[PDB]
Amino acid sequence: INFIFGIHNHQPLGNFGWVFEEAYNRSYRPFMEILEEFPEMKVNVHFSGPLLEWIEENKPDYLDLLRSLIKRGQLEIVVAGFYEPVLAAIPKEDRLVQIEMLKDYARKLGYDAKGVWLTERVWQPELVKSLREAGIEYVVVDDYHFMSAGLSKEELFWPYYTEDGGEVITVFPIDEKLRYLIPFRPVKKTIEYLESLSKVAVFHDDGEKFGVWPGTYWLREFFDAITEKINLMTYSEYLSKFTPRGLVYLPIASYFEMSEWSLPAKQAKLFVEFVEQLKEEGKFEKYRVFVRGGIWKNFFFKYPESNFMHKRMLMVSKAVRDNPEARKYILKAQCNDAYWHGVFGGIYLPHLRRTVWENIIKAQRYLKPENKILDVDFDGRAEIMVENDGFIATIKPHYGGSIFELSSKRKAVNYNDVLPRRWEHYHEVPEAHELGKQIPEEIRRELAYDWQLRAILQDHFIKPEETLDNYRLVKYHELGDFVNQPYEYEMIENGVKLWREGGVYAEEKIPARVEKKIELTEDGFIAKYRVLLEKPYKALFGVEINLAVHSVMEKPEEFEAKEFEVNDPYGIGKVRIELDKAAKVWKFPIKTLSQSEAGWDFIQQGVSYTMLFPIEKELEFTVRFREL
Ligand SMILES: OC[C@H]1O[C@H](O)[C@H](O)[C@@H](O)[C@@H]1O
Numbered sequence: 001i002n003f004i005f006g007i008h009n010h011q012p013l014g015n016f017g018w019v020f021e022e023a024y025n026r027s028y029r030p031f032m033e034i035l036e037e038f039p040e041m042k043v044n045v046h047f048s049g050p051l052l053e054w055i056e057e058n059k060p061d062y063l064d065l066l067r068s069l070i071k072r073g074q075l076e077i078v079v080a081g082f083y084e085p086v087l088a089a090i091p092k093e094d095r096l097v098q099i100e101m102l103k104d105y106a107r108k109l110g111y112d113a114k115g116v117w118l119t120e121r122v123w124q125p126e127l128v129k130s131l132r133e134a135g136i137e138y139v140v141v142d143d144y145h146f147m148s149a150g151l152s153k154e155e156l157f158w159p160y161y162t163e164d165g166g167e168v169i170t171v172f173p174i175d176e177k178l179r180y181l182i183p184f185r186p187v188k189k190t191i192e193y194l195e196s197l198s199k200v201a202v203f204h205d206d207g208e209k210f211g212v213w214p215g216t217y218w219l220r221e222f223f224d225a226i227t228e229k230i231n232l233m234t235y236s237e238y239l240s241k242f243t244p245r246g247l248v249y250l251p252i253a254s255y256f257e258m259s260e261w262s263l264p265a266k267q268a269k270l271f272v273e274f275v276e277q278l279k280e281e282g283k284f285e286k287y288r289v290f291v292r293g294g295i296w297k298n299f300f301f302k303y304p305e306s307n308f309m310h311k312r313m314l315m316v317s318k319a320v321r322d323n324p325e326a327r328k329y330i331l332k333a334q335c336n337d338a339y340w341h342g343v344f345g346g347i348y349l350p351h352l353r354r355t356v357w358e359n360i361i362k363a364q365r366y367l368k369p370e371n372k373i374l375d376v377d378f379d380g381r382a383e384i385m386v387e388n389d390g391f392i393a394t395i396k397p398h399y400g401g402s403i404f405e406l407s408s409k410r411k412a413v414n415y416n417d418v419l420p421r422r423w424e425h426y427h428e429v430p431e432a433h434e435l436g437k438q439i440p441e442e443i444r445r446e447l448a449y450d451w452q453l454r455a456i457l458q459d460h461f462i463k464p465e466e467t468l469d470n471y472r473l474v475k476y477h478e479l480g481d482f483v484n485q486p487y488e489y490e491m492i493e494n495g496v497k498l499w500r501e502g503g504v505y506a507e508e509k510i511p512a513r514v515e516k517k518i519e520l521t522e523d524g525f526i527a528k529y530r531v532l533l534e535k536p537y538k539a540l541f542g543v544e545i546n547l548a549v550h551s552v553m554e555k556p557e558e559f560e561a562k563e564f565e566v567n568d569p570y571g572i573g574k575v576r577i578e579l580d581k582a583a584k585v586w587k588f589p590i591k592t593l594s595q596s597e598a599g600w601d602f603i604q605q606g607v608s609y610t611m612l613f614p615i616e617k618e619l620e621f622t623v624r625f626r627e628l
Pocket residue numbers: 179205206255257342343344433
């Protein structure tokens with residue numbers, strides 16, 4: 001029985017330096033040290049570019065340990081897109097570059113890589129062409145992948161050929177067992193033993209499992225134990241002593257657990273119980289092959305903010321294709337984490353997303369400014385992109401006519417890099433990969449869910465007797481229909497003039513009409529508001545601006561002011577809002593209940609500053625945003 005052992009080491013771009021060092025001391029270093037003392041042990045390893053760059057910077061000696069092991073036949077470098085992008089989600093031309101960059105790093109390490117670790121095992125029958133042009137010969141995918149096609153675990157112990165266009169590529173399957181056995185008391189000896197007599201057993205998983213995961217810090221025993229009649233070799237070695245099984249076509253899948261996360265909240269809940277139920281009735285093992293959930297690509301459906309971010313980098317990637325310096329930036333913005341969310345923080349970790357927006361912005365700072373209308377995120381309606389030498393503002397007429405994007409070319413930060421508070425299927429804790437935790441009351445107390453998307457200049461109408469804690473959480477009574485409703489527009493001399501004719505839906509529906517004349521300025525923007533109510537009524541009009549304060553742990557405040565500053569060192573710059581008529585300001589942290597390995601993640605995704613003004617029949621003022 002043949003055995004292929006390999007690990008996948010990666011750290012997302014933007015991760016904290018200390019997080020990096022930890023992973024290093026916790027597993028990257030130890031693993032390779034223990035590997036060095038078993039000259040017969042061969043590991044198939046893949047280091048991501050962001051990690052290799054950090055290592056090259058902070059721990060050079062480590063790269064020498066690698067050249068050493070490679071030179072003594074203990075390692076085969078597995079490659080992929082340099083910045084860990086999901087190959088299927090970035091332009092065809094970017095893959096070639098992404099792969100080639102890492103392919104070149106490996107060469108400088110002394111190895112001629114022939115294989116690619118499919119990031120997040122997201123597969124689409126089209127990576128074949130790219131991988132082939134990149135000179136890659138085999139891809140590592142999950143056994144699951146073959147199941148969803150028509151095969152059975154029983155016939156998944158050999159590598160196959162998969163094609164598209166007229167080209168083929170070798171696909172290796174990752175046994176689900178091993179990725180759950182290893183690491184955990186050499187039982188693999190049994191599964192391996194029980195493999196009898198080509199035929200391989202392939203194990204490939206995150207290296208963080210070897211020391212960084214929850215108290216995972218067995219190996220030394222596993223190494224000589226493996227080194228009997230078990231023939232353990234390296235991918236490359238295999239694809240020279242054998243030829244793939246035969247041709248088989250794969251479906252758009254990923255590893256099993258993606259099926260649940262990739263589903264929208266409700267379907268994720270539904271799917272989990274369906275899997276629990278089959279298991280309970282002990283029928284999941286004979287039918288699993290026919291049980292499937294969502295597809296990675298649909299996180300752009302599940303998290304709108306991720307979709308916008310993704311479609312914005314696509315526009316820029318094309319506009320910067322032949323611009324080497326700008327291009328490097330756009331390629332960094334393709335680091336996968338931060339675009340989705342499963343078990344790890346992902347899109348819920350501000351610094352991971354602050355890094356994507358940084359690179360999207362740096363890549364386009366020097367391009368030529370141009371205002372343009374178009375359906376950016378593909379929701380069937382058209383945004384308005386106003387841009388000057390200092391900012392890029394993207395307005396969504398069809399949605400409150402609000403500024404959904406305000407990127408600072410100067411700071412390479414997106415002021416609206418915020419997340420709406422959403423309910424995740426795993427927020428439902430019952431019973432009271434396979435660890436869990438209940439929601440502590442201290443959180444339950446502050447756990448609210450938005451019905452509004454969070455942009456800049458969202459217009460509300462509330463009761464003059466409303467409370468901040470009611471608005472803060474979502475227990476308040478929104479009176480107007482101007483937050484999530486469309487506005488008409490007309491391009492102005494330096495911006496857009498929007499307006500809508502909704503109403504202040506209270507005991508009686510007093511038809512209303514809001515007007516905002518937004519125009520970019522050399523230092524931000526300035527919006528001139530006008531709200532005339534048809535019939536007199538006692539109510540408060542409020543303009544909401546969601547800023548991406550990420551490093552300043554803020555708390556709910558209420559105060560009178562005509563002007564005020566926000567200061568997020570390590571976050572957004574230092575901005576200042578300037579009204580021309582003092583108002584009641586309501587400020588509050590946007591807390592998100594997210595999941596991770598450790599446990600629950602209550603994260604400040606931003607901070608809402610909404611200016612309340614009193615109104616009965618007529619109201620006028622001017623909100624000014626100044627970058628400092
Ligand atoms: O996404 C969560 C994890 O799921 C599985 O454990 C995969 O092997 C690993 O690559 C991934 O990080």
